[model samples]
Target: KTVRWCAVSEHEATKCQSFRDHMKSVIPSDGPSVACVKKASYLDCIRAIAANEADAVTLDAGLVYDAYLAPNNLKPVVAEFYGSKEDPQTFYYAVAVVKKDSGFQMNQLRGKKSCHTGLGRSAGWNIPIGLLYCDLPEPRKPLEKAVANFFSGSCAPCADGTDFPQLCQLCPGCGCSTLNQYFGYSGAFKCLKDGAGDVAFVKHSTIFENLANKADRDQYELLCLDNTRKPVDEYKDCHLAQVPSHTVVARSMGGKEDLIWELLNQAQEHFGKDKSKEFQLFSSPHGKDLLFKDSAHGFLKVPPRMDAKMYLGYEYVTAIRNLREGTC
Candidate 1:
């Protein structure tokens, strides 16, 4: 048997190669062998999976949600397990972080410059927009316009400035494309740190990773919808929402879910943390985290019974649909 794995990042191909070599010694000669297929971006990987050019790749919940929609039917096979070995979790938080002295509540985000990880990202775009659209009305016209109006300017990478110029107003990237240095989690934080955006939508760990020390982290605060604020460390007690983490997805129709799972389960046992030093299943030297989050310890099998919609939850699936439809 052969398992063709789709690699979304350039560095991921290198890591996949390492895993494939190690898998040779672990799997019997008759067992499935791994094949690494490379793609330019997340969307390109999705297309490959749908076309059966690749069997599987880990995806953000936002992309997973998109795969669940028309023209692409995919399902979750395994979830990235976050946290420590003793207390692992399949979820993280989406948060809006602002400078300590910004003195703005969640409702006061209007007219403030914003920073986002990227367009269609769970923490950066989807969760924040879903929350903001709650009080907005259609009289404001297109939902994109409402977002443009709310933030005076923003660095939302992957936004086509040609179509949505307002969103790219704050981005320093070339034409507001992914080429923008401040495009992902760290980039969005850079936008805010440079005073380009008053608020940044990102995951909870962003501040700690970007900031130099406790002092730098102390300079920021998390915005709560309850008209309150909290230190960055209190995300669990005060956050926008708990979100599902990334997952390995496969085509629903012809996917090799069991074979893929068997490979992942066995591979992690050998290459996972503490198991090997020459190669870490979740780390890469070519790029940050490469294919999987560096914070991940191992993979957890997603219940075979859960599809994309069920895996991501009804609330999240609905939010993406409404955001796409302009009804949110």
Candidate 2:
């Protein structure tokens, strides 16, 4: 049986092709043959996996929650390990950052133009929006309406302009694709740097990873809920909640789970940073990590025992659930 991996790529021809070439060479010759099925967006990839068109794909915890619902019934098989290979739990933080000169507090974001990693990303959407509207009544319209009405303008890629024009008001209109130039972590940061957005919602490592100089790094600050601001690295103590890193998911039923793990384990053993540099499994030229985080130390098997809620923690699961239910 073939283990079809759903790959999310804006430029599938380039990014996904490179990954497939390496995956073909590295997965055990005796293991299930691997195929890379490229999708236009993460959501499309999720749908494909649910429909049995593909076997696995990497997803943010928010999207993982989405995959678990409805007819999908997918579960995470492997999770990206960030700090160390020995570390069992992999996680990162979602932060609200702004140019230090912006002089904005968390409560003061009402009229500011915003930049988001994407429309449904954990760091960029679920966490920030959930916090922003926690106390307010859930809107009758799509939640994007409330976001559109809140920010003066925004560049949330994947947002439907016809249905939520306000949310797309600040977007560069690079086109309706997720690969639209102003989409992910780097894209949102670019939006803020280009003066298109007053504040950017992105991961904590974003500024330091993209900004080269200390001067540029020093120019930014994190917006804390305390109505104060702090430097980016201090996210451990001062910023948003600790979020689970991306997970590799597959259909719960009829998924080649054992073979998937075998391929991944061997793939990491052969292609991981310390193992081989010829064709890095975690590196991508066009983005931070095409299929996975470049900084990932290795992949850890998600405990066969833990489902999405247990894997993502109770707080995060609730946050995502609230957002999906439009209760926040």
Candidate 3:
């Protein structure tokens, strides 16, 4: 059998060619062959896969939720793991961060200038913002306006600079995309560090990755769900929400998981991690997370119970709904 990957770029197609070439050289291999199709956009790849034009594509947990709706109806067959190779985790936490001595917990987040990863990101927008909107006395029509008015000003990257200027003002080079000075997890952390925003919405490990040491890490604290605070290392207890890791999505109706898993499992032994210079299955190296996370150590097969809404978690999905529509 051959696995037709809905590659998002011509470069991705080239890598797929090399993956095929490498597999071709294997002597009496115990696996299938590979093929590539370039679609030029991630959502387009989702569309292509939904229409049965291709086999699979790696999508973020958020996009996986997106793919679950309407004509797309896709599900995850594989997941990526980050952190240490010895202990792999398939989930990450959405955290709201403040200085240890901020003298406030989750309650006082209102009126504080905010920093966030991006507009639709789980940690930055959906999870944190959703939690914040609980018991919102007066919710706004569209979500952005409500969020923009709550915080004094924000560095919420990817928000409309002209239309929702308050959200993007604190973000230097607010042109949108990665070029925005406060574009991602690290960038949002820096926004808080520079005092541009009083609090930052990020994943559990972002501060540690952006800061120097444990001492610097200790200088920050997390805002918990019970309207309290705790150390950043206490993410399990204090996180705003828990979200599943990025997953490779395939058609739910005609799922070709057996072939895809066999192909990926076979490929990983030879090309995964530091296995091959000729091909890196999960290494983008200071670039975008194309097919998989650049820092991922391995791909874990997802359980049958954990697809789409199950993978995204109920609180996260409910919270996102609360944000998109005024639930209070």
Candidate 4:
């Protein structure tokens, strides 16, 4: 038996291949050969899984919901943990950050230049956009237009700017690929730091990563759903939504959740963090988080009841849908 790993890029595919090579010898008696299946993007990986061309791929919570949508019905089999090995955190909060002096309330984000990790991202797009969406009485599909209409200018990369030019005007990639400077959380934070955007949508840990100096971090504040702002560390009380971290999604039927878990559990033991020198399960020297989140402590097999919606949770799922319906 083989557990095919669907990879989204050349570096990720290369790392997956290395994973296969390393696992070939370290694999347990019941373990299968870890194989790599290449896809161009998360969307392609989902399609490939549906076509039975690939078995699994890691994805953010937002994309997990996308794969969870009907007809595909993929389940979140395992989750990557952060914080501590003994007491790891399985969830993180999506937050909106702004300079403490910006003095903009959560309800007052309209007309401000905004920065986002990227389109379809949970913290950056789904949660924040959904929040903005629920406020606008103008209900519409393709919520992109509504978001673009609110922000005076934005830098949400990996989006098609044809109909929404202002959205990508501040983006380095012009809303394209990894080459885009303002594509991820770090990049989006920098967008606000550079004064190109008044607000930046990111995860709780994002500010700490960019500003190792607590003093600098203190200069920022988290915009709470209550229309108030608080210190960055107070994300527990001030965030858009509490969401599960990156997850590995598998097809609903014949998804081989057990098989995938069997391999990842063993793989992380030998390759987690700095466990190996040749290659690391959570690192890609070429780029950041190529195959798996570099910060992951280990893989935890979600209980059988944990599917995509279960993994994403009720509130998160509701927040995402809120964007479509313009209601709570």
Winning model by TM-score: 3
Q: Any runs in candidate 1 off by more than 4 Å, and if so which?
A: 95-121, 137-145, 148-239
**lDDT assessment of candidate 3:** 0.79
Cα RMSD (Å) per model? 5.3, 6.5, 3.6, 4.9
What does candidate 1 score on TM? 0.67
- Each prediction's total of clashing residue pairs, residues at least 3 apart in sequence or on different chains, is 1, 0, 0, 0
Per-residue lDDT for 73-118 in model 2, tens only? Answer: 8888888887665554487778888888587798888888888888
Tens digit per residue, CA lDDT, model 4, 139-247: 4555776777788889988766887777897884455566777879788998999989999999988898899787889888889878889999899888888787788
lDDT of 3 at 62: 67
Alpha carbon RMSD to native, model 3: 3.6
Candidate 1 lDDT over 1-328, as tens digits, reads 7889888766889888877887886778788778999999888888898899999888878888877666878888887887776888888778889999788898888778989998777788888887777655445466566677677888778776666688888874314344676788888998888888999999988887888787779988999879799999888777776766778888888889888888877767877767888777878777777777887888888887677888776556666666767663
TM-scores, one per candidate: 0.67, 0.61, 0.81, 0.71
Q: Model 4 scores what on Cα lDDT?
A: 0.83
- TM for candidate 4 is 0.71
Scored by CA lDDT, what does every candidate get? 0.80, 0.77, 0.79, 0.83
TM-score of 2: 0.61
Whole-model lDDT, model 1: 0.80
